[PDB]
Amino acid sequence: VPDNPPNEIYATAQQKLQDGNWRQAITQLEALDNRYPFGPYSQQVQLDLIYAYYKNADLPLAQAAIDRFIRLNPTHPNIDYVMYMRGLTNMALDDSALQGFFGVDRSDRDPQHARAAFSDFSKLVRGYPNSQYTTDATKRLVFLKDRLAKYEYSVAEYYTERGAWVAVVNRVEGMLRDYPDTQATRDALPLMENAYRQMQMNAQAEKVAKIIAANSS
């Protein structure tokens, strides 16, 4: 961890970064970013260093940096970058695990960081539809959308897996007036009718049968 002049140490940083010496790269990047918090070299170190965080997977520290800087400077065409990176930090904070490699039974866990990220990327794609990542942030958003969808679907399903129909019906109507297109929803549609006849909400089962026989073929 040197304290070389910002030019030299920033060059060696870029070397270790396009290299991928994430640990030492981050050490020296932080060394510069603190040795001078100000200067184009400094804020370049800032963006490259939050990049080396989120890739080195310093997602607590990554969110720390992104939000500390939106405090430090709130708007930029890197609010493309900033919104994207803070949302994506929330995202891989939701998805920081090894089952993400084993790859079985995901997305029914927490979306709270993921909803922070949906807000983030959405404010982006609407206030910044002008980015190199716009439709990629959209890929984020659609993933996150169907993701939280099937999450809550699993959850309400579990609730009725105990057997109490009424609250599950509440959950599913809520998610309905939220975003009723994900297959989580269309698959949730059997749940309400089953619950209805179980609660003997016969006519309500009929009405939801109409709306699904519409939505279904």
Partner 1 sequence: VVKDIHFEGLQRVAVGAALLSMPVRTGDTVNDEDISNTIRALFATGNFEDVRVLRDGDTLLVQVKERPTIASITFSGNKSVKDDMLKQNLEASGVRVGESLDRTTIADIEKGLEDFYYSVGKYSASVKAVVTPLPRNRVDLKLVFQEGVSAEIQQINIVGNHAFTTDELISHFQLRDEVPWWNVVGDRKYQKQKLAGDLETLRSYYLDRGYARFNIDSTQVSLTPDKKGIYVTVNITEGDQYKLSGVEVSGNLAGHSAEIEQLTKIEPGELYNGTKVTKMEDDIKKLLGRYGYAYPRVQSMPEINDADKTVKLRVNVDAGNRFYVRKIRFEGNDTSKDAVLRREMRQMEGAWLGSDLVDQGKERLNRLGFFETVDTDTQRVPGSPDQVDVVYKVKERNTGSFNFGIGYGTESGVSFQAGVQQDNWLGTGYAVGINGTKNDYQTYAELSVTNPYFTVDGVSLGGRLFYNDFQADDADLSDYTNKSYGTDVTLGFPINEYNSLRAGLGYVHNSLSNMQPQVAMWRYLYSMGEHPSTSDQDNSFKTDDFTFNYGWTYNKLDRGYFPTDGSRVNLTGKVTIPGSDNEYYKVTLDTATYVPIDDDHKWVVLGRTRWGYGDGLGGKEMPFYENFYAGGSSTVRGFQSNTIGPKAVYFPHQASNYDPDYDYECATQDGAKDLCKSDDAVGGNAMAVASLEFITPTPFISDKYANSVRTSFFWDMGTVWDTNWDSSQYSGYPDYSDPSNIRMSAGIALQWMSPLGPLVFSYAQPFKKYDGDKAEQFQFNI
Partner 2 sequence: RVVYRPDINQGNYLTANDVSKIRVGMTQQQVAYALGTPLMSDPFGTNTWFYVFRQQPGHEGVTQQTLTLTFNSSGVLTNIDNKPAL
Partner 3 sequence: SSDSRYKRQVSGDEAYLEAAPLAELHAPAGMILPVTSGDYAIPVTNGSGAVGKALDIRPPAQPLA
Q: Which residue stretches of 73-201 are H helix? A: 79-94, 99-102, 112-127, 134-162, 165-178, 183-199
Which CB atom, from 60 or from 129, has the smaller least distance to partner 3?
A: 129
Q: Does 109 interact with partner 1 (rule: CB under 8 A)? A: yes
Q: Does 97 interact with partner 1 (rule: CB under 8 A)? A: yes
Q: Does 55 interact with partner 1 (rule: CB under 8 A)? A: no
Which CB atom, from 5 or from 190, has the smaller least distance to partner 1?
A: 5
Token digits of residue 211: 């709306």
Nearest of 124, 127, 121, 113 to residue 141 by alpha carbon? 121
> What separation, in Å, do the N-terminal and C-terminal C-alpha atoms of the chain show?
64
The answer to whether the CB of 208 falls within 8 A of the CB of 196 is: yes
Binding segment for partner 3 among 64-72, 153-161, 176-184, 192-200 (CB under 8 A)?
A: 176-184
Where residue 105 falls (left for φ over 0; alpha for ψ -120 to 50; beta otherwise) is left
Q: How far is the CB of 110 from partner 1 (least distance, A)?
A: 4
Q: Does 177 interact with partner 2 (rule: CB under 8 A)? A: yes
From residue 145, alpha-carbon distances to 79, 160, 178, 210 in Å are: 22, 23, 10, 26
Which one among 74, 75, 163, 200 touches partner 1, defined by CB under 8 A? 163
200 binds, among partner 1, partner 2, partner 3, none (CB under 5 to 8 A by kind): partner 2
Chain positions 44 to 73 lying near partner 3, rule: CB under 8 A, are 44, 47-48, 51, 55-57
Which one among 4, 41, 64, 194 touches partner 3, defined by CB under 8 A? 41
Which one among 166, 178, 186, 202 touches partner 2, defined by CB under 8 A? 166
155 binds, among partner 2, partner 1, partner 3, none (CB under 5 to 8 A by kind): partner 1
The answer to whether the CB of 34 falls within 8 A of the CB of 18 is: no
Q: Does 164 interact with partner 1 (rule: CB under 8 A)? A: yes
Q: How far apart are CA 38 and CA 49, in angstroms?
A: 14
Q: Which residues contact partner 2 by CB under 8 A?
A: 164, 166, 170, 173, 177, 199-200
